[PDB]
Write a protein that binds this DNA or RNA. Structure first.
Lengths: 123, 132, 47, 65, 21, 136
RNA sequence: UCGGGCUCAUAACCC
RNA sequence: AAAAUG
RNA sequence: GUAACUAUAAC
RNA sequence: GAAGAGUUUGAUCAUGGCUCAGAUUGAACGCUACCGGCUAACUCCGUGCCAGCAGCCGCGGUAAUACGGAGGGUGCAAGCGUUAAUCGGAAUUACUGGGCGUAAAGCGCCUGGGGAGUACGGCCGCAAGGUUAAAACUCAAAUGAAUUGACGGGGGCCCGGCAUGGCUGUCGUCAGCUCGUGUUGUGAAAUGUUGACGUCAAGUCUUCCCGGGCCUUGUACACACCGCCCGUCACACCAUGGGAGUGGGUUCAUGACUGGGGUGAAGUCGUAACAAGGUAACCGUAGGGGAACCUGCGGUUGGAUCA
């Protein structure tokens, strides 16, 4: 805290580590699906969350969450992944971007159509 | 003559009470139709109820009627044993199987290992009947 | 659709193996006006 | 670029006359001025500290653009 | 003294709201 | 004649044999808008009784403050417990830029031009006292 | 191992 | 002297 | 002889 | 020319992380947002801890303002959201502008808890080890003081129908229970007080043993001791050392098996700690032992009671 003390050793700025390491300072990352499955959330929450292991172009192999309802995803397919960590599941830190590449949009959706890759209906 | 194995899971007292309720339910099913209610293996609960039971069913077409009965049973019911008076979603399996050197034993086990991996790969379709 | 089993390689019984994993858990219901009932912040919060 | 919807709806949320309409018919006789827009209009909601400041900012946007 | 038991304001849990003078 | 404003309502609890007894704590401030301000703090079983009691406590115990026509005399630092309030005067046409604990006090007092940031504790009941300590 | 008792219930103990 | 658990 | 399929067995 | 708010607790005050409201960009992606709180904006139908949501708190277990749809609304606008990146809020590395008795920390040191005062390396040592000192990963807390209550195998003084309305039992015919006015304290709250308030989502569509009352004391309990909770072992999965080494450009990847750690579903084995936690705990140390740990030795009050 002393002025003379700060000259000998400057204030060590806390290194802001990214919550999403596998993206490598990128908005979205393309990666092939290794294993698509479901696993139960931690503690009180009780469900089956749709999650897939994605082997990325950079080299990292990370588990990513699939949103929406009734996903059309199987093994050995290209999936574009974004950040944002799912709190319910340990290890899962990534979201499947729906309606991109081999991944398709959610069947029969009206509200929040842009987030789930669903086109605007005629009516 | 098929064997049925009832097992309690995830619950210390709630599952064992449900396993005992399911134990009496299948025995009364066998008694009403005209089947043998012989029990080979039995184990009572640590607090109250039943942990595991194996009941032999003997007669005509024993596995034929108990084919669709196989699976995990869901019970959505309040616990009389819990002090808090809570609602519980408890589970109990009811595996039914019909009645039947080292190289042959390993090959039979490997065929069994691949068979159980196929049944489990479906998902949580074992949850066949719900009770409320 | 698949489920990652915490057992791993299931050998004897599949239905009984899933029965003893967190998929078929003992689910607890947060009962109001009893034991373990208090909510500091409600479902909609105080008005 | 421009608000093309109902101009009467903008005055209802503010709860005051801001002379948005042409001015042939009176604001109170033609439309419900005191009533909140849409379905929920019978009840009076407790507006937050952020809300009071935001409505004042929106008041300028409704008159000028 | 006045007492109103049960639902008040469309609540799921029964409220035993009361007043004393 | 005097303006009255709420800061924060908090639900507090006293535990007994039979569960909990809940009380509502209302924090209110009164001011004419010339150079007089006083904080009020209440405790009641119901929420409409709490706001009425806290305002009644606010009417008495009121402190005087000198103002340079809608603004403070000098940059002043008020400290109450953990909370640390800094305040700074401004020219005409800036507006009340302060926290709710602060901005509610400064609104009723007649302070129109003020630059204020809370440090350390930002918990409303101490920040209001630290603003009063700064003005006094 | 089973039956009863003790305890809010189980284990231990007692018959 | 004794009282492990929930 | 015994534990969250089984196996093993801290006990 | 400087805004905070949500989140630990029964409630409080801190301390302190985590998160959000802002501005931007060499942007990408979806389409031609959102309405539980922060944070401006709520109702009905459908599902039933399922499907789903989520930035945090957390929501859904049959009446969902949080999911899905519809209506309405709100903000922005040819853009809109989402993600990423930097700063800001963060006086959360503090020169302006922080601290260090107990919260992390006595010129030195601290920057959430756990991982961990450990790993690896270096120094030191005869060894035990000590010092220096992380990272990945993981949780949205861990903590400090004080307040209420309960409990104590602490003390004292004494006493024998889970949507409901209505109705009834129960502690218990026990003697308590508080509200206003004030005052003290930042505040919870205290002061007053040295067949009720209610409880169980109860039932119905005079040493000792048991209980109660009051006061004081300790508390890691508030589901209130029928509480919490620690450690093996067992089953996985993730990351991480050691590893006969191997293969690349001292470092990176990989390596059977193993060391320790984390996360796991009220598993098995105890019950170690929190009350004189039933042998006061804890610190260092050495020796045991399935395992919390036990014992010796010294030290400490952050131990109670002193009848």
């Amino acid at each position: 805290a002393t002025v003379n003390q700060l000259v000998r050793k400057p204030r060590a700025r806390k290194v802001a580590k990214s919550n999403v390491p596998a993206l490598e300072a990128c908005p979205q990352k393309r990666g092939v699906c290794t294993r698509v499955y479901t696993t139960t959330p931690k503690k009180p929450n009780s469900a089956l969350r749709k999650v897939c292991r994605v082997r990325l172009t950079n080299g990292f192999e990370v588990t990513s969450y699939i949103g929406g309802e009734g996903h059309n995803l199987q093994e050995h397919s290209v999936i574009l992944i974004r950040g944002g960590r799912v709190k319910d599941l340990p290890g899962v830190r990534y979201h499947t971007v729906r309606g991109a590449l081999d991944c398709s949009g959610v069947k029969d959706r009206k509200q929040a159509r842009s987030k789930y890759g669903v086109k605007r209906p005629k009516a | 003559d098929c064997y049925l194995d009832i097992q309690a899971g995830s619950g210390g007292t709630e599952a064992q009470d449900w396993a005992s309720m399911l134990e009496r339910m299948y025995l009364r099913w066998a008694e009403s139709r005209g089947f043998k209610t012989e029990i080979i293996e039995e184990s009572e609960g640590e607090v109250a109820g039943i942990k595991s039971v194996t009941i032999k069913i003997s007669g005509d077409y024993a596995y034929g009627w108990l084919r669709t009965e196989t699976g995990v049973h869901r019970l959505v019911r309040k616990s009389p044993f819990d002090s808090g008076g809570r609602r519980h979603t408890s589970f109990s399996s009811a595996f039914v199987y019909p009645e039947v050197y080292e190289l042959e034993m390993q090959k039979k086990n490997a065929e069994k290992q691949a068979m159980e991996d196929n049944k489990s790969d479906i998902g949580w379709g074992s949850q066949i009947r719900s009770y409320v | 659709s698949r489920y990652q089993h915490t057992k791993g390689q299931i050998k004897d019984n599949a239905i009984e193996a899933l029965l003893h994993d967190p998929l078929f858990r003992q689910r607890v219901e947060k009962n109001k006006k009893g034991k373990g009932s208090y909510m500091r912040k409600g479902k909609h919060g105080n008005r | 670029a421009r608000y093309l919807g109902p101009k009467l709806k903008l005055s209802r949320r503010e709860g005051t006359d801001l002379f948005l309409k042409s001015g042939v018919r009176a604001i109170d006789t033609k439309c419900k001025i005191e009533q909140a827009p849409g379905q929920h209009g019978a009840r009076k909601p407790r507006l937050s500290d952020y809300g009071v400041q935001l409505r004042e900012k929106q008041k300028v946007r409704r008159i000028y653009g | 003294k006045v007492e109103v038991s049960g639902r008040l304001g469309g609540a799921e849990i029964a409220r035993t709201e009361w007043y004393r003078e | 004649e005097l303006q009255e404003k709420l800061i924060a309502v908090n639900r507090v609890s006293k535990t007994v044999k039979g569960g909990r007894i809940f009380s509502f704590t209302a924090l209110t401030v009164v001011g004419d808008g010339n150079g007089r301000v006083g904080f009020g703090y209440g405790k009641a079983r119901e929420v409409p009784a709490a706001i009425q009691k806290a305002m009644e406590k606010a009417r008495r115990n009121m402190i005087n403050v000198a103002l340079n026509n809608g603004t403070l005399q000098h940059p002043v630092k008020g400290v109450h417990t953990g909370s640390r309030v800094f305040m700074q005067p401004a020219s005409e046409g800036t507006g009340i830029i302060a926290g709710g604990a602060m901005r509610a006090v400064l609104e009723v007092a007649g302070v129109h031009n003020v630059l204020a940031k809370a440090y350390g504790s930002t918990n409303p009941i101490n920040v209001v006292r630290a603003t009063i300590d700064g003005l006094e």
